[PDB]
Structure 1
Amino acid sequence: PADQPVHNYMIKRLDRRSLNAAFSIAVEALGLISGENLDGTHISSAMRL
């Protein structure tokens, strides 16, 4: 005997991945960035730059 034509379905699921990268910034410099530790000189400004 003959045969009917076959159908089918299917699904494929995802998966999870991620990236990352550390960025550490220092102590003495975080004092100068925020202007807290900044002093009024012609030398502290250059170090902040």
Structure 2
Amino acid sequence: HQPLIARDGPHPIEQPTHNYMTKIIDRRALNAAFSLATEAIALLT
């Protein structure tokens, strides 16, 4: 909502305005990898 002051005289008298904004979310992802050897699982028995 824009405030509009009373500007007077011979000036063109204007009306209060409205604006509406829509924003699309930018989306990202992450990658974190950890490697396990096949022998490391065999130690977990």
What is the TM-score of this pair, normalised by structure 2?
A: 0.58
Identity %: 62
Structure 1 segments of 4+ aligned residues over 3 angstroms from their partners: none
Name stretches of at least 5 consecutive residues in structure 2 with no aligned partner: 1-11
What is the TM-score of this pair, normalised by structure 1?
A: 0.55
| Residue-pair matches, total | 34
- Higher normalized contact order (CA 8 Å, seq sep 6+, divided by chain length): 2
Q: Equivalent residue of 1:30, what SS?
A: helix
Higher helix residue share? 1
